[PDB]
Amino acid sequence: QMYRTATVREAAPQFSGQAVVNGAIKDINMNDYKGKYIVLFFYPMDFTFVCPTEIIAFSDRHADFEKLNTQVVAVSCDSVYSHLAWVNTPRKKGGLGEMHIPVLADKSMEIARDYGVLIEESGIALRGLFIIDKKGILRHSTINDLPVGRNVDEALRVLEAFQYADENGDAIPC
Amino acid sequence: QMYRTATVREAAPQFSGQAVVNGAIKDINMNDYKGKYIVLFFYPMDFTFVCPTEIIAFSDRHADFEKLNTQVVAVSCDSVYSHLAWVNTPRKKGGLGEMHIPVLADKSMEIARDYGVLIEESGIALRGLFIIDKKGILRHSTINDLPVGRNVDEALRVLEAFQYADENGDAIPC
Amino acid sequence: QMYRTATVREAAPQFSGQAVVNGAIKDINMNDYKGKYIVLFFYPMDFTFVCPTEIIAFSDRHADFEKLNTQVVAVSCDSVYSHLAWVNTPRKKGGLGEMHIPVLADKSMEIARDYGVLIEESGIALRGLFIIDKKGILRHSTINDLPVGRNVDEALRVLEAFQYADENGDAIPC
Amino acid sequence: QMYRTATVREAAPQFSGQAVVNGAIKDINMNDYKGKYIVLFFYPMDFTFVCPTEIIAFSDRHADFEKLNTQVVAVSCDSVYSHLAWVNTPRKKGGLGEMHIPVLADKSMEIARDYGVLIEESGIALRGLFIIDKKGILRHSTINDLPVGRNVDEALRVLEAFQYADENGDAIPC
Amino acid sequence: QMYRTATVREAAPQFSGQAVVNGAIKDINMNDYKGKYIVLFFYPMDFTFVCPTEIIAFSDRHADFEKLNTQVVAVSCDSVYSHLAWVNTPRKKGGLGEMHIPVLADKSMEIARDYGVLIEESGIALRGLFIIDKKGILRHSTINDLPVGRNVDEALRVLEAFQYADENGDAIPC
Amino acid sequence: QMYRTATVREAAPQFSGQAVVNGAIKDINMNDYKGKYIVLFFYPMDFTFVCPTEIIAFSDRHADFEKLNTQVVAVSCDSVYSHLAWVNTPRKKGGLGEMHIPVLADKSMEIARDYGVLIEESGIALRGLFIIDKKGILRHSTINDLPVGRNVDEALRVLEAFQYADENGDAIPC
Amino acid sequence: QMYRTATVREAAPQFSGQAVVNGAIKDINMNDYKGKYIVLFFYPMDFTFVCPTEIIAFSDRHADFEKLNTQVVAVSCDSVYSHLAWVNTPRKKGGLGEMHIPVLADKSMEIARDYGVLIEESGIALRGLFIIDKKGILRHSTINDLPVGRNVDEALRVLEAFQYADENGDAIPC
Amino acid sequence: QMYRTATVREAAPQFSGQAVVNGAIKDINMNDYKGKYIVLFFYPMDFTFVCPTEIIAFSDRHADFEKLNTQVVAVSCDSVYSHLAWVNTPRKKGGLGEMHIPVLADKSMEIARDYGVLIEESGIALRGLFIIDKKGILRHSTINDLPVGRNVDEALRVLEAFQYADENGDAIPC
Amino acid sequence: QMYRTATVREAAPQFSGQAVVNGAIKDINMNDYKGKYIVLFFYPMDFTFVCPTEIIAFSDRHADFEKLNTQVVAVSCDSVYSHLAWVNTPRKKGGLGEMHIPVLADKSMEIARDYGVLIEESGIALRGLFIIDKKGILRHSTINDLPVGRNVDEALRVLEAFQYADENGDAIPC
Amino acid sequence: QMYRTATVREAAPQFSGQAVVNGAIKDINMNDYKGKYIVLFFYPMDFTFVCPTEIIAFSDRHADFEKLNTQVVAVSCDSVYSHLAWVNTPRKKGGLGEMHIPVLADKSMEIARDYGVLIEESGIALRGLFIIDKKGILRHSTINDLPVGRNVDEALRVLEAFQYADENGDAIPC
């Protein structure tokens, strides 16, 4: 209908808004991370009944991203004051105690609309993974459906495979 | 741009979706309440830092509505699994322990868009009160801004003033 | 169809025209009241059979508004020479003897069209209350239907609740 | 912009609404007068400061119209409850005590818009006279401006001149 | 369809073309009469079978217009060489011998189209009277149908009533 | 702009209206002459200063057309009551005493608009000659300008040349 | 559909292209003849079976045009190399031996499209005669159909009648 | 701009009109040749100065086409009466004496417009060759420019190569 | 611009065309695999210089897909006769000797246009992975860029995670 | 739908992209060959089962083009890495060993779309030959269908026939 979303060859549309960094409502922009890579985790709903092992398995692996010159930016289309209550609720309660990831909140749904991972009649974002390299170009579009989950072992395989490639031109010999 | 919103003379657009009734995700429709009146409380954000005295003061006064043949239907543009976590969190924590109101969730934002109480760039609903009489006609549009609050003493004054009037024709002599 | 009306978050459209101030046809503009707040009372018809207790109960309470840095601006879509005949007709006749409120007249119906409180096929304005703060931003949209009435005790509660809030930032702690 | 107004050769658009007949709010339609002629008096404002000799001089001459098979239908774009207060206010006060004319009220301004006698930015109707013969065809368009007045001696000359002509074909020999 | 015609509140569209002044084809424009008033007599057809008492009764009364600072401008949608043959044909033959009025000819029908007095399928102008005051504003729209006639006693009453009013402001006290 | 006018290969648009036949206002249609040919003489103005030798030279030659199975239909965009006054005015006065041609009058200018011989800003028809054969097909378009004239010797040469040809197929051997 | 063709009051559209002058393919433009008049002879087809007496009767009369300050410009929608073969073929063979007329060729059919004498589905030009005076204004539109022919005695009568008139103003007294 | 022309994979648009078959104006249609193949020779101009060896070299080779189940259909955008004069003019004069090919004439230029071989501003067809197989599908589009020529040795090579192929499926093994 | 591509919640657009199954050009449709799942591997170019370990690592793992009720359908926007030459060329030459995957060919580029993995100015498909479940709903959109590669260990993790989930409702408890 | 393709009279649209020159992926543009002529060979598919005698018969005849100041530019809508594998595969295998022609690759299909030789639903180019002279003007459009082939003996006949003609003006005398 418009916008054109975000392609895997062209530049990713920018994202901004309040976010939860280290337990606080701090404004987070895409331009704050220029020079690194950024990895978005759209995940649909807040406080969901599923023990959220998918999102925790990137806060537990956040040390693996600073080795690879990147910052994961988790994101959902729920209220930012609701994400702060979901970081602050302790685990074994459907909680995210001390999550070391900027959990964005596109409660405007202006951004998950842009990335094309929004179910419009449901308002929730499809479980999407988006790697933007430091040029500002979106480079990897992993969009799952709702019931399946993402993986950290593939989001580190592919994310390592760009910087091994883009240093060495654009061809991998082996 | 379209829709036309909901007027105070014409029929209110219908609302539906998952909701929190008595601590459970139960589907709630406008057609389930035909014959009663319905009073919507748009309130912007979930788990907000303000001690939510505005919304609690209708669950504490829910007995005054069954005397007046009506059901209040609180509503916000946040996730329904986030409202369930906000009813379940106990009070003096920014909580709503045992709220006897169907707390809707228009996380699609298809309905607060219709009622014209949505701030589009913020995604949150303006603090709006909407009385629809049993014909399906919207009859009272109280829309505050964000920082001020609603009142139960006016939402019972006006809501009593319809049924005292619509029984006695359409004119009040005193 | 156009105009877009007046929202509760955006700036209110201006109003102007002849009005009844202290029993005289004096031109009254929104820009004459910049710095104060303004409270509009749309009321549908002139010389109506109902003893107009709704409108009188703001002229009797006009001292409560100069304490709160605001001027109520009553308004109807009837002729300004008809409002002057309705202020001049004495009470217990359906009259408004010595009303200390600028009673506007949008007999063009260009303004109650803008505020969205006009019934187009009837020409009369819905019983609407509109609080614009001194920035020019509409901040409270109370629109009743015809047979019910407004209240002075809520239009002083909400109007006090802005200036207590907007002095103290935008959050109320209690 | 649309409508096309009412021409002097084509059929006049119908008029309806509440009106003041003999001091009462009675519904008056054009179809109630089929077979007679109808003579409209648009006059701009209600309770105007001018001693309304223009409108009174047709209630004083209403016997001259039942001799000529016609009913004058005075009309203004003011509220019908305001016309009832203007018939009920006695003369030498800017009043119309016992006016034997159906004083219409197009407070919707849907009809004086159709007849093209409405000043849109002022909302008031130009001082217009409209003779529709019993076929439903508008036949005489006298539209003055505001400060000048109409006449009963011409609105009886022309109105007699139709029925003397339309009985005798369409040509007057002398 | 366009043009918008000429209203009774707005400025009248200009008229020009060849005309019969004192028995000669002389060009006559609206701008030649600025400062006076102008009174148009649309009359439908030339050399009509009716003894044209309507048009003669303004040439016989042309002295009454120079007392009132105005020039009547008779006009028809027939050829200007046909009007000259109709002034030159003597009376008791359907003639207008020595008519002291500029008889215009809008044989283009560009002007009676503008004034809205043209029957398009017949090409003839409705019997219309139009008073434009010296500002260029059309101020009186008397449009009869074909078989009835105009009057000089009303076109002098109304035309005197402007200049008595516009000298004395815009209100007539008696 | 529309209509498409009348071509010399396609069918001529029909013409109708009041006309002067033998000194009387009789309705004349194209369908009244089906089976004959018809020859139109558009001529611009009525009662023109030129001694109208162009039009008279077809009434003087009207016997030559009944030999050739055709009826000339003279036509102008002036009033039909003006043509009757121009047939009735005697010659050596710019007259047409006893003209044996149906002198049409398209005072609507709906037909000379169709044939494309109308000067729109002047309202007068170009001096046009139009031969329609009995199929209803326009077959000859002679359109002069204003100051030059037509001819009877060519309008009989060409008009004879159709029926000599259309009897003998469509080719002339000599 | 567009273009607007060439009228008899407005300026004629220009014509250009290769032509046959004195047996040679020479470029001929309208601007080469400015100051003279130009007379076009559209004729439909080349090498037609009819002994082309219509076109020859202007080459035989070409001396009569240099007396009248004009150049006839014959024209057809056939190839210019086909016109050269039709001038070069001798007479009594359907030929035009030594034709002293610039025989144009609008084989583009861009010009007979402009003059409105083209039968589009047949591609051939209607037998048209067009007199443009030296101002560039088309002044005479004689368009026959196919089987009938033009005349030199009328194309000299009318062409003399312009210059006798346009020297002596625009009116012919006799 | 429209039409879409004729492609080399899709069906060729039909062609019709008068043509020269064996020295006579006989109507020739595409549907008369259904079951054979058809080979069009657009050639630009008639009676051109070039000794037309290109077109003659298919009438001299017309026996080679009846061996290959096809009829060449030469075609030009000149008049059909001009082609008949060009077949009838003897050779060593730029002639085509006894040409055994149906020489079409699209003097309407409706068909060379369809095939896309028309130079619109020149009206002449580009030297085009078009092989339509018996299904009605255009199968070979050889379009030269003007000064170069076609060939019979390639228009027999390709035309043999279809029927050798379409008999043996659609693949040629050697 | 249109199409709308293929979403991760809605139904995937169908794909068809010639393909390489077991070394032969066999037609392969989406409807041939209804009941299974289908996994597409868009890969950009044929015979690329990179030793194509990405595509081989699904033919080597094709036994793991028949255990999971699915058929991988590799696809590229190159010619199907070029894929057959790339399966037939042996390995250590940039070859795919005995690839047990239907290698599609959307050389029309109508399908990789639909799935949104086509670089339009380059014509090559982005390295995309697409899991459609047996309802026909696209369920997983992994789109890499060109230089990085896909993985079989994630395309088996996610593909197992649907059927473990869709058997057990839509929620995974652990 | 747009583009307009490439005509045989107008300028050919430019072509660019990677190509196979002497066994290497070298960028080839139309502007690199300005001053020569260029001859394109669209051929549909790569590695086709037909022993490609059509394309080889221009690499075997490439010496005949440098005598005629031209460079053939073979082109197909297949991948450029697939053409390199098709030059490198030796003959009697469907190969093109040591082809001395720049084999272009419009794998974008932006150029065979422009030249109008693309079958859109098949993606393959029709077997087309295109001679552009050194002005940049397309001058010869030979488009065969798929199963038939081109010829070198005609693509040297026509290509010699331009430069013999364009040196000697534009007419060939013999």
Residue numbers in the entry:
A (entry chain B), B (entry chain G), C (entry chain C), D (entry chain H), E (entry chain D), F (entry chain I), ...: 31 to 204
Give the original sentences from the paper that presented this experimental model.
We recently reported that the mitochondrial 2-Cys Prx of Leishmania infantum (mTXNPx, Prx1m) also adopts two functions, as a peroxidase and as a molecular chaperone. The catalytic activity of 2-Cys-peroxiredoxins (from hereon abbreviated as Prx), which comprise the Prx1 family, is mediated by the active site peroxidatic cysteine Cp, which reacts with peroxide and related oxidants, and undergoes reversible sulfenic acid formation. Once activated by elevated temperatures, reduced mTXNPx decamers protect a range of proteins from heat-induced aggregation both in vitro and in vivo. To obtain insights into the structural basis and mechanism of mTXNPx chaperone activity, we have now determined the cryo-EM structures of reduced, heat-activated mTXNPx with and without a bound model client protein to 3.7 and 2.9 Å resolution, respectively.
The overall size of the central density attributed to luciferase was consistent with a single 63 kDa luciferase molecule. Local resolution analysis identified uniform higher resolution (~3.6 Å) for the core of the mTXNPx ring and lower resolution regions for the inner face of the ring (i.e., 4.4 Å), indicating structural flexibility in proximity to the bound client. Remarkably, in the cryo-EM structure of client-bound mTXNPxred, we identified an additional inner ring of density that extends from position T35 and encapsulates the client density. Residues Q31-T35 of mTXNP were modeled into this density and identified to extend from each peroxiredoxin monomer at the dimer interface to form the inner ring. Based on the position of the N-terminal extensions, residues Y33 and R34 appear to contact the bound client along with additional residues in the N-terminal strand of the chaperone that were unable to be modeled. When refinements were performed without imposing symmetry (C1), the density projections remained present, indicating that all subunits likely make bona fide contact with the client, although some variability is observed. Thus, we conclude that the luciferase client is likely bound heterogeneously and in an unstructured state that, as previously shown, is competent for re-folding. We found that the N-terminal extensions of mTXNPxred become ordered upon client binding, and directly contact and encapsulate the client.
